[PDB]
Write a protein that binds this ligand. Structure first.
Ligand SMILES: Cc1cc2nc3c(=O)[nH]c(=O)nc-3n(C[C@H](O)[C@H](O)[C@H](O)COP(=O)(O)OP(=O)(O)OC[C@H]3O[C@@H](n4cnc5c(N)ncnc54)[C@H](O)[C@@H]3O)c2cc1C
Ligand SMILES: Cc1cc2nc3c(=O)[nH]c(=O)nc-3n(C[C@H](O)[C@H](O)[C@H](O)COP(=O)(O)OP(=O)(O)OC[C@H]3O[C@@H](n4cnc5c(N)ncnc54)[C@H](O)[C@@H]3O)c2cc1C
Ligand SMILES: Cc1ncc(C[n+]2csc(CCOP(=O)(O)OP(=O)(O)O)c2C)c(N)n1
Ligand SMILES: Cc1ncc(C[n+]2csc(CCOP(=O)(O)OP(=O)(O)O)c2C)c(N)n1
Ligand SMILES: [K+]
Ligand SMILES: [K+]
Ligand SMILES: [Mg+2]
Ligand SMILES: [Mg+2]
Lengths: 567, 541
């Protein structure tokens, strides 16, 4: 039928509630206030949704991020006007940089008060314009389902990202009196979507040219990033291709977990803080197959000397770069490409799979590299009798202790040295288990991301590997964890005695001279004040028992490890 | 063309320091990161600046607001690119709404990297456009003095407010190689003057004519050092009763016999009745907010009648021409800085010995209509209004200068009403944006501004939870703030931490009151405690 009457007689708040169900939302992160009251009241006390409350709206925002990254669903945020809205700008910017689907609803002053400098009237659509894929102010209750459907579709398509929908108080309190078009109330499908001959042929041409090229070269590497994780079936098809054509796999920071690092063909992470084996494979390589990765500055060296062996194979028409990329703009934006395969990376891998010649082996490649490893494993000064505890050692031990439980394990982090140590020294096996702020690098991300991930995956063991300065940013959310019941495991690598700011350093043995020390709280007393268990390690001898207790503990728990200040 | 060589050979960082000095800045709030390092290092390393480190950049922003409100000086904020900048959007919007001078410097990716989706490239100029008076991205070290002086001038003139200056790391790291025009280095420096002097004369005439005038005073009187003194001088000279907005509290001594205290929806009846019966309203640095006026068509009926009869009405001393005749039609608008214009007006004011009938009516009202609320009965829970009244007296008996900040919620209004306001720049509260979590970092910044003052944060439990991580910042900064938590948490139920164990974990004394009989002693212990201290009082809902 043309018109939809099902919402007639409902308030905007009740329509919002119905629309969340139609979008298969079962979790909302948010915080009350006068402007959002009509919606908050319709949602907060409803059997249909788990409404998770932070102590600060920024915490709702990062919780929604961790929920989205752990679940593959959009994270939904509900906050009030004015400071409620301006408080979620950092999580929006964070979600925008990392391509995370987030739908932010902000209460607003009534439509009739817009542009009068009313109490808590902020220009939220203007403020959030550069850090959302799209935003809108809803102007009448008739328009509310439309904008909700548009918000969820835009957030979850192309490269996923945050969107904002501004909700004037008079609009959500109003009752819908008349029918509205059915087109505007039904969610988009994007599933069983028809395409034309023209469209089909276009992609298949680029698919054939790349299928023949991989089949050509036999010094290739798969260079994989976050985009392979944006389809349920990405990692499976990635391993399928890796196996079939015996192709070594290296990932970005944001692609960690998309490939089993135990697999003999794993190169692990590449770039500035990546391992030498991966990087050398890339300066070499006649063919880089880039899959859902954007060639960030920290991954590529200088562009010029970056993968010249691939550039030479390109000039000799025998290799180069293939880019499986969903957003045409990011194609040839940083490095110039030979073949572009536009669209969803996983879908295009699938289409391409049959056209791939099964490969025996490459051992001047495979038996090679496998020796690059020996001469360049990750190296750090390891403990000696009496020495301080090394953070890398903590992370390796913790990885093993978590693995021993046989549980699904999800790791979030703060931002800093501990973030890279986590990336490097944990052994990554499963998709959607490393949840870290990579594109914006938001300190304070770790704890609320862990809480939202835990809500997404109640059976998972969720560990926040955090820094002391990062953790201070958002530590009020400890009580949120206790209130939500989420049994997150919060690890603080406390290296407070070295400064936050490097003033200079030795040329070689990176002895760092630093300043700017923050005064930390007592983290164990803090944890107990907030209602959770606190554990502390001061010496090597107690590390193993405390890590075991940390992981074994029922309920949320904080473990502080005092660590050595020099890497 | 006059050229200056004195910065040549300096990095943008040292130039930044020198410009801070010329702007009389000695305090900076902020948080380091890579993009702002060339400037952060210069400021951190110089003993000419007290750099105050929060645990979150939002805390730096609200500290800077507290500092500005307490000192009359702009609050200077220094943060890094990306999330450093986005974390200060709430305090910018807060300062924008409340008209608080603030200069925000954000580190940015190098000029060459703008437009490349670089690590922490945020469009900060775009994000902050609607919550700053002005903002700019500095493009070369040559223009760094110019943009810094421009920023301070704009932040501190007209209606004060926040400005943002985006600093690419290649610009602040660069060494200045060329002479730059001397103008660009020196902080700031007739039909309209005649129209203003005419208005001053007409305003004097109307005031001299009035039989029942009322001064209606808001935040704008606090934006010049001499505002409160001239307000009092005018009130004494012409025997005019004075009511303040919420944001004008402290600008007039509420113990003065001529004080009407606060007007508005939550103001006292006597202030509202005086305004309703006045033949002349003299509005000084106040916005005519609808929480103050109520239904505008019913506001000041006796002043409207006097205007209709050519013998009174409304005078408005207002610095922004856009705010004139925006809400109420006025008989006379005196455009420009209120303090300045009061000073020019003063000699034209007729000294009035008495307004006996008018103050008799006012004093009758004061007796008939005090603030009222259900007070404690035996065994009952403590009332928050009672805590505030008792604490106002205890704080005043210390003999100290006392500054009050608050959170946002019912306690904020109770503080405004039930505290006795005596001195200017002592009520520091988020009114225009109503940002929960304001109270603690604002108190820390106010304490930095006035290290000898007793600084009390009257806070609520939900508001306090927003920014409680800054408790450790108070300890590190050596600011012995007195944090009062009025805990009315028995719809939406939030789990609070144990606030006393929290305070101890953060490094400061924690006190709790649960019963009426404990309250007096604990309030005394609270204000007498030497360092930072948190007192939680469990109150009725
Ligand atoms: C202190 C610090 C140090 C860092 N150093 C490193 C480092 O050493 N090594 C490193 O790798 N990173 C490092 N980074 C992280 C870096 O900033 C980037 O965040 C990261 O490299 C991006 O990885 P990505 O390209 O996989 O993800 P993204 O930035 O999310 O880009 C993914 C690409 O895939 C595309 N895409 C998305 N979905 C799909 C789809 N369905 N199909 C096809 N394409 C899709 C996107 O459009 C995008 O172009 C560091 C971060 C910090 C905070
Ligand atoms: C539920 C609720 C109830 C409230 N109840 C009350 C109440 O009962 N009473 C009350 O007062 N408030 C109340 N408020 C707060 C009220 O809404 C306003 O925030 C407050 O009254 C504004 O104070 P103001 O006009 O002094 O300050 P501002 O809004 O800052 O306005 C100051 C005016 O002075 C001008 N100005 C600035 N500097 C100068 C200068 N140098 N020279 C000349 N002019 C200058 C400005 O341009 C501006 O027009 C309430 C708020 C809420 C949410
Ligand atoms: C919100 C925010 N402010 C500032 C920065 C800049 N910054 C990046 S790492 C870092 C120090 C991190 O300290 P910590 O969390 O203790 O990690 P560590 O390096 O000690 O492991 C800072 C200040 C940032 N990324 N985010
Ligand atoms: C950042 C932010 N989020 C939400 C609101 C909406 N809000 C205004 S008052 C209030 C409750 C205040 O609680 P409390 O701090 O405990 O003060 P109380 O009213 O109990 O005294 C809320 C949620 C706000 N003003 N600011
Ligand atoms: K690893
Ligand atoms: K009072
Ligand atoms: Mg640290
Ligand atoms: Mg409360």
């Amino acid at each position: 039928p043309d018109m939809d009457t099902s919402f007639v007689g409902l308030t905007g708040g009740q329509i919002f509630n119905e629309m969340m169900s139609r979008q298969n939302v079962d979790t909302v992160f948010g915080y009350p206030g006068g402007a959002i009251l009509p919606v908050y009241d319709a949602i907060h006390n409803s059997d249909k949704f788990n409404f998770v409350l932070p102590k600060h709206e920024q915490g709702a925002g990062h919780m929604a991020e961790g929920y989205a990254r752990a679940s593959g669903k959009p994270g939904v945020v509900l906050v009030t006007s004015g400071p409620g809205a301006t408080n979620v700008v950092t999580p929006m910017a964070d979600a925008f940089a990392d391509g995370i689907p987030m739908v932010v609803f902000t209460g607003q002053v009534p439509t009739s008060a817009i542009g009068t400098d009313a109490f808590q009237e902020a220009d939220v659509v203007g403020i959030s314009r550069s850090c959302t894929k799209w935003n809108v102010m809803v102007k009448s209750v008739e328009e509310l389902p439309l904008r909700i459907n548009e918000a969820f579709e835009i957030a979850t398509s192309g490269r996923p990202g945050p969107v904002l929908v501004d909700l004037p108080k008079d609009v959500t309190a109003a009752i819908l009196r008349n029918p509205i078009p059915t087109k505007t109330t039904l969610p988009s499908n994007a599933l069983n979507q028809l395409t034309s001959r023209a469209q089909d042929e276009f992609v298949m041409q680029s698919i054939n040219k790349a299928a023949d090229l991989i089949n050509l070269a036999k010094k290739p590497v798969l260079y994989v990033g976050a985009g392979i994780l944006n389809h349920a079936d990405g990692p499976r098809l990635l391993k399928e291709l890796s196996d079939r054509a015996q192709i070594p796999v290296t990932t970005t920071l944001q692609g960690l977990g998309s490939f089993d690092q135990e697999d003999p063909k794993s190169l692990d992470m590449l770039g500035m803080h990546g391992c030498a084996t991966a990087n050398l494979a890339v300066q070499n390589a006649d063919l880089i197959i880039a899959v859902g990765a954007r060639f960030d500055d920290r991954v590529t060296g200088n562009i010029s000397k970056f993968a010249p062996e691939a550039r030479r194979a390109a000039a000799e028409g025998r290799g180069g770069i293939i880019h499986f990329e969903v957003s045409p703009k990011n194609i040839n934006k940083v490095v110039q490409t030979q073949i572009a395969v536009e669209g969803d990376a996983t879908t295009n891998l699938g289409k391409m799979m049959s056209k791939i010649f099964p490969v025996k082996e490459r051992s001047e490649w495979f038996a090679q590299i496998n020796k690059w490893k020996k001469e360049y494993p990750y190296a750090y000064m390891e403990e000696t009798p009496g020495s301080k505890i090394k953070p890398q050692t903590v992370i390796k031990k913790l990885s093993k202790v978590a693995n021993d439980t046989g549980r699904h394990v999800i790791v979030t982090t703060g931002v800093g040295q501990h973030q890279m140590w986590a990336a490097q020294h944990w052994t990554w096996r499963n998709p959607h288990t490393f949840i870290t702020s990579g594109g914006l690098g938001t300190m304070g991300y770790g704890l609320p991301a862990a809480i939202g991930a835990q809500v997404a995956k109640p059976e998972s063991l969720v560990i926040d590997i955090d820094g002391d300065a990062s953790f201070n940013m958002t530590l009020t959310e400890l009580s949120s964890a206790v209130q939500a019941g989420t049994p997150v495991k919060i690890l603080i690598l406390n290296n407070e005695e070295q400064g936050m700011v490097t003033q200079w350093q030795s040329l070689f043995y990176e002895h760092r001279y630093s300043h700017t020390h923050q005064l930390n709280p007592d983290f164990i007393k803090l944890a107990e004040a907030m209602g959770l268990k606190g554990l502390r390690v001061k010496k090597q001898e107690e590390l193993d028992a405390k890590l075991k207790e940390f992981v074994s503990t029922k309920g949320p728990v904080l473990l502080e490890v005092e660590v050595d200040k020099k890497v």
